[PDB]
Amino acid sequence: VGSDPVILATAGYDHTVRFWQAHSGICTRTVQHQDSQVNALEVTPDRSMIAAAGYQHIRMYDLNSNNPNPIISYDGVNKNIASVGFHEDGRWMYTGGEDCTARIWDLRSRNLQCQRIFQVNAPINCVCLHPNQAELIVGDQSGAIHIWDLKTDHNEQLIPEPEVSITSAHIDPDASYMAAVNSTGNCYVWNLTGGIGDEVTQLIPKTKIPAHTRYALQCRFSPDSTLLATCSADQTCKIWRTSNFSLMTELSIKSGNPGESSRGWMWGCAFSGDSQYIVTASSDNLARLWCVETGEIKREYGGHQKAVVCLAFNDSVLG
Amino acid sequence: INLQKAWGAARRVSKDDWLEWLRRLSLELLKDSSSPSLRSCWALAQAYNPMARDLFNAAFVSCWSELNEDQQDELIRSIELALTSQDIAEVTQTLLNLAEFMEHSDKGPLPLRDDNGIVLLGERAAKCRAYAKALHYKELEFQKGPTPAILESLISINNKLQQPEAAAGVLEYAMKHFGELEIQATWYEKLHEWEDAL
Amino acid sequence: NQIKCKNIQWKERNSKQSAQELKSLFEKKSLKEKPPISGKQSILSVRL
Amino acid sequence: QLNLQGINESTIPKVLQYYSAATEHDRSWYKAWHAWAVMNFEAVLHYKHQNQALSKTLLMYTVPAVQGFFRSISLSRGNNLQDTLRVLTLWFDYGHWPDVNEALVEGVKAIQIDTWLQVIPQLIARIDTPRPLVGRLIHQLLTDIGRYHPQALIYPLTVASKSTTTARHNAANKILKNMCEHSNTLVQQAMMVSEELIRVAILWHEMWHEGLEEASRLYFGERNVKGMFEVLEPLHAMMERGPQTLKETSFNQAYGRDLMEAQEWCRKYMKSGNVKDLTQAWDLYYHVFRRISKQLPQLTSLELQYVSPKLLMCRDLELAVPGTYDPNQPIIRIQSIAPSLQVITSKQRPRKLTLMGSNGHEFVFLLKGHEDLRQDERVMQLFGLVNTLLANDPTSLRKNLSIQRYAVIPLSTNSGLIGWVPHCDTLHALIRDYREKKKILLNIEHRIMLRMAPDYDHLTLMQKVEVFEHAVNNTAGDDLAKLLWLKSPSSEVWFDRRTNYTRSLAVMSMVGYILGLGDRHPSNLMLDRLSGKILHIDFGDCFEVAMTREKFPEKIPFRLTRMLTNAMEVTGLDGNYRITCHTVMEVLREHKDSVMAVLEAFVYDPLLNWRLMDALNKKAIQIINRVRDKLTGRDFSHDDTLDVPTQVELLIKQATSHENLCQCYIGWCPFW
C-alpha cells in the first residue's frame, strides 16, 4: 500500500524494485522485475500506475493496491529503451526508442490513431518534453539536438559542437531556459522561447559553463526553476542557481582513502516539491538523502544487493 | 659450512688477486655440493679453468638452497662488498650473469640490501659496457615512480643504445606527465633538438 | 493460473491517412500556470 | 600545372604538349614516358566519367596511352607490375576495338616474356571472356608462356579444368590439350595429383554432412524444393559413378541403401507435389545426419593406405614442390609423400600434410577445405608489392621494415594449401600457458564482468563503459612483457626482439587499416619465438565489411589493447610506434598510384564480389572512393586535408577509446 503523499521507488541489478517513504528509511514493498534491467521509471500524475522502462518491455506496476506481478506491459521495440514520459493530463506517453526514432503510445483503449513516430539518423539518449506538451527535445550521441513539435511531424536540428555525446536534457515547468550537458563536462544554457504564435521556438546559447572534468551523468532543474543539480562520473554532484549560475552546493563521496577505487557513481538525483531537499542515487548499492544547504547527509537506504541505477520520487502538490 | 674462510680476508688488492680468489671460490663451491655430478666434475675443474667458469651458476644455486639464513646473510654481504669494491670487467660480468640467472629461477631474485640492489647493480652496469642490462634495470626503476633523474638516465642510455625514437618518446612523456617545464636544455642537447635548446 | 498479463505490440502506418484530425487532436498547447506558490516542506516536515 | 588547376579540356592539351616535348627532348627517360602515359589514361578516365550525365576522341586519347605503357615497360626492366596492370585493364576494357588490337599485338610480341610472370593469375580469371578477339589473344599469350615456362602455369590451369561453368572448362581443355604435345607426362602427373589430394581434403561423409547441413536450413527458411534439389543433386551425381577406395566403399556399405531410397522418394515427390512424399525423404536424411554427426569428433588421424591408394605409390614425379617455383632457380621435384596425415581439431579440420622433395628437405603444409583462398593470393601479392615499395627507400630500409609472408596455393573452388610457418605460435596459447603456469584462471576478466552484472550483453553503452573500466583497472594487465622477458636467453637479444616486435606491429597495423582488414582476435595472430616478429593470417574479412555488418559491428580500425600497449615500451605508444607510423604513412601516400591500381585490379574481378555485394558496380565504386580518401587525408571529412601526424593521431585516439572498445564482440577479447 503506497497510498501516501510522498513516494520513493528505486531499481537496480537485483531484478526487483524497492519502495519506501522518507520517514524512517525503511522499505515496505519489493516487487519482482526479473530477467532484464530498467532504464527509466516514472509514476503517472493520477498516482494510479507507474511505468518502468528497459530492454524491449515497459512494465506497469500499481501504487495503492498490492500485486506482485507486471499487470500491464507494452512491447514491440527491438532493443533497450532510452527514455519515457507521460502526458501531464494523462492522455498519452512519449518514449524515445534508442536506435533511431521516438514514438507515442496512447493510454485510451481506442483506435483513435493519434500515435506517431519521428525518424532520426543517430542513436538517442535523452528526451525532454516541453512543459506545455507542445515541443519535444531529443539529444543523441552525436551532439545533435532536435526540437520537434506535434503541430508538424518534422524536427529542427541544431549542432552546437560535433563529434560529442550529449547525455541529458531537462526543462523546468516554469519554462525559463534550456540546459544540456555533454559527456566531457561542457554545459550549455540557452534563453527561452516566447513564440507561442507559430511554434517558432527561438533559443540563443547564452552560457557555456565548464565543469565536471569526468563524464557528466545527469542534470536537473528545480520545480520552482531556481536551482540546477548536476551529477558527475567522478562521484560528485554540484548544485547551481539559475539566476547567475553560481556555486551553491557541492556533495562528494570520495572517502579520501584509495581503498574504494570508485566503487560507485552518483548516477541520479531528485529534488523535492519545495526545491530544497534532494535524494542522491549511487551505484554503490545504496542511496542517500540530502538537503541543498547543510551539505551533510540526513537519510540513507542500503537495502539492495547490487548497484542502484534509477529512482522515482513524487510528493504532494502541497509545498 | 667450511667456506667462510675464503671471503672474510678483505685483503685482495689487484685484478689477479680477485681472479685467483674467484678461482678458489669456485673450487670450494664445486668440491662439496652433495650432488655426485658436480662433485665428480670438481676434480677435473681443478685441472681446467674455463669449464669451471661456465659452471659457476650451477654451483652457486645448488649450495645456496642448502645455506641457511645467517650464512646466506654473510654470503650476500660479502658478495655486495666484492661487487661495489672491484671494477674489473670479467668479475663484474660474472656477478651480473649470476644475478640475471637467479632472477629467471623460481626462487626469486637474490635479495640485496635495498630493492635487490637494482640501483647499485645498474650503477656497475654502465662501466662494464653491457647496456641492455642497464636499460632493463632502469625499467625496473621506472615502474615504481617517475623522477627526472631516471628520465635523463633513460635518455642517455637510449642515446648510447642508438635508438633516438625511445628518447623522443621519453621526451613526450616528460612534457605531458610531469609538465612543469623543469626540462633543462641539456636534455635537448642530448636529443639533438638544437632549435629547442636555443 | 498463468493467464494474468496484458501486452500490446506496435502497429505501423499510423495516422498516415488522416492529418487534419491530428492537426488539433493533440494540438492543445496548454501553456499556463506560470504563477508559483510558496511552500514550507510539508511532507518532509512530517519526515522531521 | 596539374597540381595547380586540376583537370579540364583546357589544361589537357597544354600538359599533353609539355610532356610530349619532354619525351622528344630525352627519349631515354623512364619517368617522361611514364608521366605521358599516365596522363593519357587519366584523361580517358575523365572523358568516360563525364559523358554519362563519339568513342573516337576517346579512342584517339586511349591509343597513345597504350603505346606509352608498352614503351615504358620496355625501359623499366626490373619491377613494373603497375604499368602491366594498367595495360591489362585497358586490354580488357577496349580490346574489342580494331584500333586497340594492333597497338596491343605489337606491344605483346615486342616485349620480353618473363614480365608476364607477375600477372599469370590475373589473366586466367578472365579466360572466359565474351569477346572472341581478346580471348584469342589470351590463348596465344598463354600458349607461349606455357611452351616457354610450363611449371609457372600448370596449377591454376588444372584448377580451371575442374570448373563447373561451360566456357571456362572447355577453353581450359582446349589450352591444356594444346599443352601436352611438347610436355605431356607432366600434365598427366599433375592432373592425377591435383584430382586426388583434393579427395583427401573433403572426405565423402564430411561433404555429405556439409550438404545436408546447408539443405536443412535452406528448406526450413525458404520452402524451396528446387534450391535443395540443386544443393544435394551433385552428391548423388558423384555417388552413382561408384566408390573407388576402401573408405568410400565402407561409407557406401554403411549408408547407400538409405541414401538412394531417400532419392527415390524425393523424385516421387517432384513428380506430383504433395508433402506426403518428401516428409519421408527428409526424415531419412535427418536420421542419416544424426548418425553421421555422432562420430565427427573422433576423427583424429588418416593413413593414406585407407584413403587414397594411388598417392603413396608415387616415389618420384615431375612436379616441383607446389607453391615454390622461381624462374631464376632450378626446380626441386617432389620426391615422396609420407603415409600419415594428422588432423588438427577445429571447426574446419585442416590437415597437416608433409612432402619430401628432391634435395632431402621437408615441406610441411596445411591442407584447408571448406573455404575460399583466392582472395588470399591477391592480398599476398599486394603485401609483396608494399614490401617492394619499402625496399627501395633509404630512410626506411635502414630500419628493416617488411611483412613476413607464407606460401598460398589454391587447389580448387573450395580448398587449397597454405604453407606452415615454423616456430610460430598463436598468441592465445601464450597467454593461456603463462596464466595456467601461475595457477591463474583464464577468463578472470569475464568472470568479474559477469559477477557485477549478469545482463552484461544488454546494457547501454555508458553502463558498459563503467563496468568495462571497473573490470580492466581491477586486474593489472602486464602478462605479455613478463612472459616475453622470462622467455629470453639473454637481455640483449630480448631488447632486439622487443624492437622488432614494435616495428613489425606498427607497419602491419597501418597496412591493415589501409586495406580494411578485420577480425583481429588473439587466435588470428602469431608470434615468432625466434625473431619476435608479428604475423597475420585469416585474410577473409576484407574491405571494411565487418564494420558494416549488423550483429556486433566493430568500430575500431585495428587491434591495439593494453596488453599490446604495455608490453611494447615503457613510455607507451608514443615511442617507436608513432615515428614508424609517420614514416610508413608518408611512404605509402607518395606512391598512391601503385597501390591504388593494384587494389583496383583486385576489386573489379567479377568472380570475387560475391562476398561483398549482398548500378551493380555502385557499391564497388563506393568503397573505391573511400580508399582514395584513406590515401588523401579526407576520411573524417573530405572538405579538408590534414597532414600525416593529424590523421595518425586521430586514428590512434580512435583505436584506444574506451567507449568504442565496449561495443565489440565478447569473444574478440577487448579485455586483453
* Residue-wise DSSP of D507-574: HHHHHHHHHT-----TTSEEEETTT--EEE--TTS-SS-TTT-SSS----SS---HHHHHTT-SS-ST
Q: C3 in contact with A at a CB cutoff of 8 Å?
A: no
Cβ pair A318:C10 closer than 8 A: no
**Which residue blocks in D542-670 are alpha helix, DSSP H?**
562-566, 576-590, 592-603, 618-632, 644-655, 658-661
Q: Taking CB atoms and an 8 Å cutoff, what residues of chain C touch A103? A: 10
> Is D660 marked as a binding-site residue?
no
Please judge whether A36 and D458 are an interchain contact, meaning their C-beta atoms are less than 8 angstroms apart: yes
- Assign residue D280 the CATH number of its domain: 1.10.1070.11
Between chains, do A36 and D453 touch, taking CB under 8 Å as contact? no
Whether D460 sits inside 8 A of A167 (CB atoms) is no
Resolution in A, one decimal? 3.3
Q: Is D306 on the interface with B (CB under 8 A)?
A: no
* Portion 260-299 of A in contact with C at CB < 8 A: 272-274, 276-277, 299
Q: Which residues, 6 or more positions from D371, have their beta carbon under 8 angstroms from its beta carbon?
A: D348, D414, D415, D416, D540
User: From CA D208, how far away is CA D236, in angstroms rounded?
Assistant: 10
DSSP structural state of residue B178: I
**Nearest to residue B96, comparing CAs of B121, B73, B74, B115?**
B121
Q: Inspect the interface and report whether the beta carbons of D574 and B163 lie closer than 8 Å.
A: no
The CA–CA distances, whole Å, from D607 to D160, D166, D625 equal 13, 15, 21
- Find chain D residues with C-beta within 8 A of A141's C-beta: 461
- The letter for the amino acid at D58 is L
Distance CA A201, CA A199 (A): 5
CA D534 – CA D403 distance, rounded (Å):
9
**Chain A residues within an 8 Å CB radius of C23:** 151
In this complex, is the C-beta atom of C13 within 8 Å of any C-beta atom belonging to chain A? no
- Residue D293 Cα to chain centre, angstroms: 31
Taking CB atoms and an 8 Å cutoff, what residues of chain C touch A117?
14
What is the rounded radius of gyration, in angstroms, for the C-alpha atoms of chain A? 19
Name A92's Cβ contacts closer than 8 Å, sequence gap at least 6.
A86, A104, A105, A106, A107, A114, A115, C26
Q: Are D466 and A306 an interchain contact pair (Cβ–Cβ within 8 Å)?
A: no
* Residue D298 domain boundaries: 195-368
- Report yes or no: A130 and A171 within 8 Å, Cβ to Cβ: yes
Asked whether B56 and B88 are in contact (CB, 8 A), the reply is no
Residue owning grid cell 568503397: D623
Q: Are A69 and C6 within 8 A, CB to CB?
A: no
Check whether D371 is labelled as a binding-site residue. Answer: yes
* D569 and B CB contact within 8 Å: yes
Q: How far is the C-alpha of D350 from the C-alpha of D307, rounded, in Å? A: 16
Beta carbons of B169 and D576 less than 8 Å apart: yes
User: Chain C residues with CB inside 8 Å of A6's CB?
Assistant: 43-44, 47
- Closest partner residue to C15 (CB to CB) among A92, A113, A319 is A113
Q: Which amino acid is at A89?
A: D
Name the structure determination technique: cryo-EM
Does B105 lie at the interface with D, CB-CB under 8 angstroms?
no
D616 contacts: CB under 8 Å, gap ≥ 6 = none
Cβ atoms within 10 A of the Cβ of D2, count? Answer: 14
Inspect the interface and report whether the beta carbons of A37 and D455 lie closer than 8 Å: yes
Q: Which chains touch A (3 or more CB pairs under 8 A)?
A: C, D
Cell numbers 596522363: residue: D39
Q: Let me know if D252 is exposed, middle or buried by CB neighbors in 10 A (0-12, 13-18, 19+).
A: middle
Distances (CA, A) of D162 to B135, D173, D500: 60, 9, 44
- Contact across the interface for B169 and D494, Cβ inside 8 Å: no
Question: Rounded to a whole number, what is the distance in Å from the CA of D343 to chain A's nearest CA?
Answer: 43
Q: Does D473 sit within 8 Å of A215, measured CB to CB? A: no
Cell of D458: 544488454
Q: Is D366 annotated as a binding residue?
A: yes
Q: D229-238: list long-range contacts, CB under 8 Å, 24+ apart.
A: D229/D266, D229/D270, D235/D207, D235/D208, D235/D211, D236/D260, D236/D263
Residue of C nearest to A71 (CA): C5
Residue A75 at interface with chain C, using a CB cutoff of 8 Å: yes
- Report the C-alpha gap between A110 and A91 in whole angstroms: 12
Instruction: Locate the domains of chain A by residue range.
Output: 4-316
Contact criterion met (CB below 8 Å) for B125 and B137 = yes
| Any B CB within 8 A of D106 CB | no
The answer to whether chain B touches chain D by having 3 or more C-beta pairs less than 8 angstroms apart is yes
C43 part of contact set with chain A, CB < 8 Å: yes
Q: How far apart are CA D172 and CA D166, in angstroms?
A: 10
- List the single residue in A with minimal CA-CA distance to C6: A72
Interior CA angle at B84 toward B80 and B88, to 5°? 115
Q: How far is B23 from chain D (nearest CA, A)?
A: 24
Chain D: closest CA distance from residue B66 (Å): 25
For residues A308 and A282, the answer to whether their CB atoms sit within 8 Å is yes
**Looking at the complex, does the CB of residue B101 fall below 8 Å from at least one CB of chain D?**
no
Give SS3 for A187.
strand
Q: Which three cell numbers stand for residue B106?
A: 623460481
D263 is in an annotated binding site: no
Q: Which helix (H) or strand (E) is D120 found in, with range?
A: helix D120-124
C14 touches chain A (CB under 8 A): yes
- What is the rounded CA–CA span in Å between residue D230 and residue A159? 55
Q: What is the dihedral of CA D465, D467, D472, D475, to 10 degrees?
A: 170
Is residue D161 a contact partner of residue D289, using CB atoms and an 8 Å limit? no
The partner residue sitting opposite A265, judged by closest CB among D460, D466, D659, is D466
The residues near D326 (Cβ < 8 Å, ≥ 6 apart) are none
Find the residue in C nearest to A107 (Cα).
Answer: C8
Give me the amino acid identity at B41.
C
Report the candidate in A143, A144, A151, A164 with the shortest Cα–Cα distance to residue A201: A151
Chains that touch C (3 or more CB pairs under 8 A): A
Backbone angles phi, psi at D47, to 5 degrees: -65, -30
Report which secondary-structure segment, H or E, holds A58.
strand A57-62
A residues 89-118 lying closer than 8 A (beta carbon) to C: 89, 91-92, 103, 105, 112-117
For residue A39, the chain D residue with the least C-alpha distance is D460
Report the C-alpha gap between D98 and D593 in whole angstroms. Answer: 29
Grid coordinates given for A295: 551539505
Residues of D in contact with A13 (CB under 8 A): 453-455
Alpha helices in chain B (DSSP H): 15-31, 36-45, 49-54, 56-64, 69-85, 89-103, 118-127, 131-144, 148-160, 164-173, 186-191, 194-197
> Does C7 reach chain A within 8 Å, measured CB to CB?
yes
Q: Is D202 annotated as a binding residue?
A: no
Instruction: Please identify among residues 192-221 of chain A the ones whose CB lies closer than 8 Å to any CB of chain C.
Output: 196
Query: Is D346 marked as a binding-site residue?
Result: yes
**Distant-in-sequence, close-in-space partners of B23: CB < 8 Å, separation ≥ 6:** B49, B52
CB contact burial B169-196 (16+ within 10 A = b; e otherwise): bbbebbeeeeeeeebeeebbebbeeeee
Q: CA nearest A125 in D: which residue?
A: D460
Closest CA to A144 of A123, A129, A115, A130: A123
- Count, in order, helices (H) and strands (E) of chain A: 0, 28
Query: What residues of A are in contact with residue D659 (Cβ under 8 Å)?
Result: 165
Residue A112 phi/psi, 5-degree rounding, is -75, -20
